[PDB]
Structure formats: C-alpha cells, structure tokens
Design a protein around this ligand. Structure first.
Ligand SMILES: O=c1[nH]c(=O)c2[nH+]cn([C@@H]3O[C@H](COP(=O)(O)O)[C@@H](O)[C@H]3O)c2[nH]1
Ligand SMILES: O=c1[nH]c(=O)c2[nH+]cn([C@@H]3O[C@H](COP(=O)(O)O)[C@@H](O)[C@H]3O)c2[nH]1
Ligand SMILES: [Ca+2]
Lengths: 517, 477
C-alpha cells in the first residue's frame, strides 16, 4: 500500500536495504537510478531511498538521477534518503561539492550526531583546534532520523572513497566522522536526508531504527507483511485446485522443496514434480535427492529424467563459462518442456511453480508458456529457512548449502568431460563429508571443491572453496581451523588418484566471486 | 667409509646428515662396484614402496636397516613421535605370556642410552609379523611388537622407526654406536672446506678464479672465502635472465658491491635473450632445459670478454645434497660435503649481513617455473608485484625468518571479478624431499590478500597452497 521507492546505484548492499524494509513491514519498490518519471508518477510512493555504489560522482559515465525525476520528488513533497553514493548524488544535484577523501573509510566506525549543544563532544576537531571554530562554518540545529537513539554516539559501517566537501543548499550538518566531516546532512524544507555510512548492513547497530524513523515518522506510511504474502497467495490458488494442474522443477534445494510442500497440500494428485538429472550433480546426488523427495512426500508425483548424456555431449569442447551457462539453460528448458508434454495435460490450465525469492525479482529488474506461480516473491533465504521448520521438514534440507543450476560445469575449469567430473566428485565428497564430520558444515554458508585445467608435479590441481555470505553480492572467505583443514587435505591427496595439489581460496567478494567461473 | 644405499626414502638426506654430525664419511648409492672401496658398515634406508646381500654377510660388513631396510633385511634373512620400550615386566600395554614366544637379550646399538624408554619418529604402513632366522626381539612399541631386531652372527641391526630425523631423541647415539662401536670406524666435513682453501692458496700467484653469482647463500659465501684469497684475480659474474623478482638484479648487484668492495663483479642484462627463446614454451622441463643452455652460453660469453683459460678455476657453491642427488675450467667446490645448515653458520663466522643467512632459496629458472604456461612480460610483471607484496609483508609481520621458503605463483587458469589467478606458497623444510605447508595466522593472511587484490591489476583471486611434500612438491612446475 504505502510504498518506498528504493533506487539502485550499483550497491553491493542493495538487497540489505530491501531486507530492512521487509523487517519493518514496508513495501519495497526496486528500480534502477535511470528510472523515468512516467513509470513512477502513478504509484503510491511515500519516499525514496538512494543506494550506494562503486562509482565516483566526479567522473564521467557515473550514474545520476534525471533532473525531472529529482525535481518530481521535491515538488510532490516526497522525502529522500541517500546512503553513501546516494548522499553524494543529492549533494551534486543541489549545488554541493564532492571530492575524494584525504583518508578512506572502511569497517565499523563511530560517528558523532551533531547538535548546537553537542558540538563540544568532538575531540578530533583538529583533523579538519577548537570545535567552535570548525562548526561555525556550518548550520546546526537543537534530527528526526535519529529519534529515540538514546546515545549521541552510534556505530556504523563505512565503505567509501569520496566525501562531501561542501554542503548543498540550506542543509544542516547532522553527524561527523573522524575521517569524514560532512558525514550526515539534513534538509527541513524538502525532507532530504543523507548519510555517508551504510545503515542497511547489520554492523550498523542503529540501522533498523533509522529505516523505521524514515518510513513511519518521516514518510507517514500506514501499512505489508512479507511473511504473510505467500499465505494469502496460497489461499487464493485454492479455487483452482480441481480444474488446474501445477508443475514444478524439483532440484533438491530448499526453495523448490518448501514451495512444493505448501502447494502439494492443496493440489495433491494434480501436482507434478520434475527432477532433471543434468549429469552435472555431485556424487550420488541424483539418487540421493530423488529418494529424499519420495521419503518426504510419499504421495507426490515425481518424474525423474536422466538427461546426463544430453548435457555432457553438448558441453564437449566448451571452455567459456557463459557459453556453458547458456547451453545448460537452453537444454534444461528443452528437457523440462519434453517432460511436461509427456504428462499429457492441458497446457492452457497449468500453473508453473517457482521458488523465486525477492533477491531474484530485484536482480531481474536490473542491468510452452505457463501461468507463473511464485508465492515467495517477497521472501529471503532466512524466511524460507524458518518456513521449512514450520513444515517440520528434516534439518538436512534447512541447513544444506545452495547449489548452482549449471552445477559442476562451472566448477570444472575449462573443458568438461566425465573423467574430470568423477575426480571432482571424489574430492568434493571427501570435503563435504568431513565438514559435516567436524561440525563446520552448518556455520558455513557455501562450501565446495573446484578442479583446475592447470597442472602440478603430472596431475590435476584442486581448490577448496568455503564462504560466509551476507546476501547475493557480498561474502567472506571462511577460516577453517588449520588442524581440520590439514586432516581434510591429507585425506583428499591420499584417497583420490589424479590430484597432487590442494589449494584453498582466501578471497572475499568483492573483488572475487564465490564461484570461479 | 660407511655405505648408505637409497631405497627412495624422503629422509635419505637426514641419515647422511647424522653421519656428518658423527664425523663419518658417507658413500651414497642406489639400491655392484663396492669391493674396491673401504667399507666398514652398510645402512639400508626407508621408502614409500613398503643385490649384493651375500657380500655383506661374507665380508662381515654389518647391516643397519631403517623402516623398509629392516623389513627388506628380514625378507633377505627369511606414525609420529612414539615412546618405544627397550625388562619384560615393564611392558604395560601387552602380560608375560606374549614375550614368552620370543628370544630376548640380557644390545650394542643402544649402549649408554641410560633410559629403557626412548622417543622415536614413526612413518610406516607395514610391520614384521614373524622374525627372521635366529634374531632377538630387542625393542617394542604400543602399535608394533616387533619394533627393533638384532642378529649377533652377522651384526645385523633393524629398526622400524626413523632414527635419522631430529624427532628421534636418541638418534645420533644409535648412529654413533653403529659406526664407532660396531663397525669400528677409526672425516670432519667442516674441516675439509678449510683444507681445500689452503691448497688452492698455492695457486694464487698464477691461476685465476671465476664464479657465477646469484645472490643466494651458497654462491656468495663461497665467493667470500675464495675472493679473500685470490683478490683481483677473482672474477664474479652475475646474469640477469629476466626471470628474477622485482628490482632483484639491482638489489643483488648493489648488495654484493656493498659487502665485498674489492670484488670484481660484472652484471650482464640477458633478459631479452631469455624471454624470446622462451616464447610459446609451456612444458616445465623444456623451460628448464632452455634456461640452462642460455645460462651457459651467456656465462662463457662474458668470460670471453675478460682477461688465461688454461689457468682459470671455476668456483661453485655445490653442497652435499646436490652431490648426493646426482649419484671448460678446473672445478673447485669446497662445500661438497656440507649442508645449508653448515653454510649458514659459515656466513655468520664471516660477520656477513643477516639478510643473506636468512634469505629463502631461489631456483635457477626463477619465475619461469612460477608462471604456469606461456611466459611473457605481462605475466611476469603481475607475478613480480604480488610476490613483492607477499614477501615484504612476511618480513613486516615477522614471519619471513621462521618460514623456510615463500613465493607467489601465477596460473594460466582465469576467474571472474576475467583476470589471472595467483597462489601463495609458504613452507617449512626439513630436507630436500620433505616439506610442510606453513600455517600463516589468518589475521595476517587476510591482510596480505586484501593488499594484493587492491594494489595489483590483472589479479582478482588469490589462493593459498595447503599441500605438503610428500605427495606434492614445493614448486608447481
Ligand atoms: O542458479 C545459479 N546459476 C548460476 O549460473 C550461478 N552462478 C553462481 N551461482 C550461485 O550464486 C551465488 C553467487 O556466486 P558468484 O559470486 O560466483 O556469482 C553462489 O551461491 C553461487 O553458487 C549460480 N546459481
Ligand atoms: O636451482 C633450482 N633449479 C630448479 O630447476 C629447481 N626446481 C626446484 N628447485 C628448488 O628445489 C626445492 C624443492 O623443489 P620441489 O619440491 O618443487 O621439487 C625448492 O626449494 C625449489 O625452489 C629448484 N632449484
Ligand atoms: Ca506426448
């Protein structure tokens, strides 16, 4: 109902602002910075959040809001909230100045919220001697965004190379940082707010409060519960349960399974689960998933197709990771549609179930045809995890790491064949089993083995990958205790013939990716 | 002289090193021409596999078998720090019914051991189940009953453990007991170095000396001793092959001039030659073979441009490990019976800078074997940058000195951000055939990695090598 427009400037933390709006029961409306006025004027927008980004606002080619779009916000009285890049965009839009900092900030940092009487509480005043001499050059007050904060100091997460040097228009200086004088800014007339830090990340302790103050106190929102949308959506599909069929790609992942559970309970013998073995799964995975699905849902239709030869022969000679991805996606569609036709039902009366989550719809709005059914459009991984517990599903499905569609094709670097896959399957198996045996599996977000086309003294070189993940675009490499890692690496090199070297990935995202290819 | 035959043990150099500690001359050979030599005892090494045997028993040459050697001796006669027991009532694990089946002495190899318990290093998958001939059961272990065996008739000795490594506390004493008491030996390695220099001093008036200067521990201290004698007649040559690390050619040349002011050093820039010759080459062996032939070419070309080949002697810092593995000018190698541990103390005895005594070894082919696939300037530049960051930070955080060898490696494989993939390699090395991967504190490793990914363009992923030798090697290629 009362929606906040959240605009994308390329931030690695974009999903986290959308997440915080979900936690605070406010409807998010995700769009790129280059949005046209025509696409927003007719919507019930109560406020706009401008995200951070990896760009420098000084340079050419940098993302900017169109003059008409920004002018629309001011005229319509729509409050604005800019974080990192968003703050700097606001500055640049309104007569202000932004330059590269003398000292770049990254990590947890304490910032002093400013007030006429609070001005004395700044000891680092010499970094930009008396604190009265510095803040005489700036307008202060005696700020709604920090309501009920209690303390005059707050811990926030930093990640910026540029800083506002000269305040725009008639703005108040509202917060300062040891390495950033113009840390937060406020405009009373247009309701414009700007912070250099990232309140969307967990580490920013008072973040959820600032998003709350903006949504309700500032933007005057009245409403939307994300963990209620799927229940409402399932209660309305119930009217189709006798005249319509539901088809679903079953992968063995948490998302497809939980969705199938809630939907099978409605459509029963009219629900059809399709599990396609692409020949790119892990050791015994094709058998283990199919058994798992039958043991969990005994009365459920589950068609399994061995398509291994189809994918494998089509992947011969292919080394380019995108070419791999495009072939695998193309052949999946072809095999899936072949399985749907083999059921022999009315295509004009079928629903395609997908466990599509919010991150997916956010990502989709960036840069046989079935009536789509995605109950989980507004949910996140942690929402799906607790929903699986409410179905009393085994712990194994709730804990297990995500697995990419292209599978081991993106994990065998270069030319893919059955000889390489078998070697990787052995290494990955020993790796995963041991992480479970030493009880590390559950605290790791995603762990896997990789096989390289490069060689050492001659046999193949394997890489162990393990990460802790915050969202789609941000992850840290996992620090496996050296005693356990040694036991895992020793085991692999003696058990698996064809591998003479094990490496460990020590790169976070950014700059690296979780996967290699 | 003591005979020591190689059965392919990862610890073969360590048994040789222990005989060097005891001051005994070694004659290293493979698993024949031995009748002409003065052999007073034979040692049989270990091996992962798990013959003139008659001559040993006939000539009364005592045998000493370790690990595999004990087991092979048993055949011919038909893991970690563990405490073995050398008296039968002391065996706690088992009580007296078991030892009743075996013959026990009431042993020369354990003389002056004091204690009836000893700590030894284990590394074996096979064990002797039935004793050969008329052998005594001498020692036992918790996981191995038939641990040590002895034959009085032929002076045969056999131990399951590895007394050659440091972990074996009473290792040197057992080696001493075999050599001096049993074999009745009646050659100081550090002394031979000094003796070979005094003999070469008699040729200072007419002869010359030439030495290939790398900047490594071995070639510099050899030059330090020999240049002191031959002064202006000494000619040290340094060749930049374009396979060295960032600014290393400048840094080595400056260091040598600063440490040895009166030394004649000639630097030749052969980078362009080495690179072009290596264009397209990927096979690691082919790389090495090319580099060696181009080294020799450029080396003797530089000697041609300096003033009598009939008189000149070639100084080399060849060590004992180098000589053991194998089996124009007058070749002079004074360090022929020495290890790196010995050369390091010789560096200190010269009052030389701590920089060289502590610097990690650097292979002859250089970065060529640290770049996987085709070698070119673009790849070398990136590897030089990463390596320089890695090493400098390892020195900054006080890790460099406790690490035996550390370096960066560039791979031909690529990864998304599509850029090059780097690997960090750091090991602690016991001997030539044994090294363990170093466990860099995670806090420090994350600081090094973050610095590399931010500073160096062309690299978006770095990995760490968690592989030990064996089965892996120190270098990739
Ligand atoms: O369904 C998928 N199809 C794909 O092509 C694909 N590529 C990466 N991933 C998964 O996405 C997450 C982020 O990985 P990257 O940082 O490597 O992009 C990680 O969880 C990856 O496992 C994929 N999932
Ligand atoms: O002078 C050299 N020329 C070479 O071709 C060569 N290959 C390996 N190495 C060095 O030898 C040690 C053990 O090497 P590996 O464990 O890689 O076999 C390590 O210290 C390596 O640096 C070389 N040194
Ligand atoms: Ca049909």
């Amino acid at each position: 109902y009362d929606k906040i427009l959240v605009l994308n400037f390329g931030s690695q933390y974009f999903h986290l602002i959308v997440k915080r709006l979900n936690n605070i029961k406010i409807f998010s409306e995700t769009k790129d910075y280059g949005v046209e006025l025509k696409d927003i004027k007719d919507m019930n927008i109560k406020g706009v959040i401008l995200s951070g980004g990896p760009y420098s606002v000084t340079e050419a080619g940098s993302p900017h809001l169109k003059k008409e779009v920004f002018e629309y916000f001011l005229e319509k009285k729509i409050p604005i909230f800019g974080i990192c890049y968003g703050m700097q965009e606001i500055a640049v839009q309104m007569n202000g100045e932004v330059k590269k900092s003398k000292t770049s900030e990254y990590g947890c940092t304490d910032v002093n919220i400013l007030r006429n009487d609070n001005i004395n509480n700044i000891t680092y005043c010499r970094n930009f001697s008396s604190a009265m001499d510095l803040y005489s050059n700036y307008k202060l007050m005696n700020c709604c965004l920090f309501e009920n904060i209690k303390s005059d100091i707050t811990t926030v997460w930093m990640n910026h190379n540029d800083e506002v040097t000269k305040i725009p228009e008639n703005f108040y200086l509202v917060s300062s940082s040891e390495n950033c004088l113009i840390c937060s800014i406020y405009n009373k007339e247009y309701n414009i707010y700007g912070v250099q830090y990232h309140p969307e990340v967990y580490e920013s302790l008072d973040g959820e409060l600032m998003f709350y103050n903006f949504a309700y106190n500032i933007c005057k929102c009245k409403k939307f519960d994300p963990i209620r949308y799927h229940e409402l959506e399932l209660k309305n599909i119930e009217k189709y349960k006798h005249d319509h069929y539901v088809i679903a790609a079953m992968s063995g992942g948490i998302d497809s399974t939980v969705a199938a559970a809630y939907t099978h309970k409605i459509f029963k013998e009219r629900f059809f689960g399709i599990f396609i073995d692409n020949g790119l799964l892990r050791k015994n995975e094709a058998e283990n998933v199919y058994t798992f699905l039958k043991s969990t849902f005994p009365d459920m239709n589950i068609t399994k197709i061995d398509a291994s030869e189809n994918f494998l022969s089509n992947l011969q000679g292919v080394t380019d990771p995108e070419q791999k991805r495009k072939i695998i996606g193309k052949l999946f569609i072809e095999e899936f549609e072949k399985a749907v036709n083999n059921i022999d039902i009315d295509i004009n009366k079928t629903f395609l179930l997908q466990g599509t989550l919010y991150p997916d719809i956010i990502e989709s709005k960036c840069s046989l045809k079935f009536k789509l059914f995605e109950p989980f459009k507004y949910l996140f991984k942690d929402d799906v995890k607790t929903l699986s517990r409410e179905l009393n599903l085994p712990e194994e499905i709730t804990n297990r790491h995500p697995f990419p569609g292209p599978g081991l094709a993106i994990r065998v670097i270069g030319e893919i064949n059955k000889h390489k896959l078998n070697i990787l399957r052995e290494v990955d198996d020993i790796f995963i089993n041991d992480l479970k045996q030493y009880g590390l599996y559950n605290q790791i977000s995603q762990a896997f083995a990789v096989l390289l086309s490069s060689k050492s003294v001659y046999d193949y070189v394997c890489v162990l990958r393990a990460v802790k993940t915050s969202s789609f675009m941000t992850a840290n490499w996992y620090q496996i205790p050296y005693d356990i890692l040694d036991k895992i690496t020793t085991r692999i090199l003696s058990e698996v013939k064809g591998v003479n070297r094990i490496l460990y990935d020590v790169s976070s995202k950014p700059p690296a990716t979780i996967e290699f290819e």
